[PDB]
């Protein structure tokens, strides 16, 4: 359903505890693939296979997915 991916830069360190979650450090640029629910994005690290979900509150949203 998404027509344009978004992007964000991490503003907090996030340790995912499960396979569905994507860990990252402050400063990592993340492509936003979709908003999963009220609290989580699915994203990916550009040029890689790191993909999974993380909390919206842990990133600075530059562009929302459309």
């Amino acid at each position: 359903m998404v027509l344009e991916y978004g992007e964000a830069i991490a503003k907090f360190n996030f340790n995912g505890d499960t396979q569905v979650e994507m860990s990252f450090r402050k400063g990592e640029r993340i492509t936003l693939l979709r908003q999963v629910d009220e609290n989580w994005y699915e994203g990916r690290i550009p040029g890689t296979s790191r993909q999974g979900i993380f909390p919206i509150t842990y990133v600075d949203v530059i562009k929302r997915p459309l």
């Binding site: 907090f12 360190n13 569905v20 999963v36 629910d37 609290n39 989580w40 979900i53 509150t57």
Partner: peptide, 10 residues
């Protein structure tokens, strides 16, 4: 130090 982790999606 970070915001509390929200509950996971369904």
């Amino acid at each position: 130090l970070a915001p509390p982790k929200p509950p996971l999606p369904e």
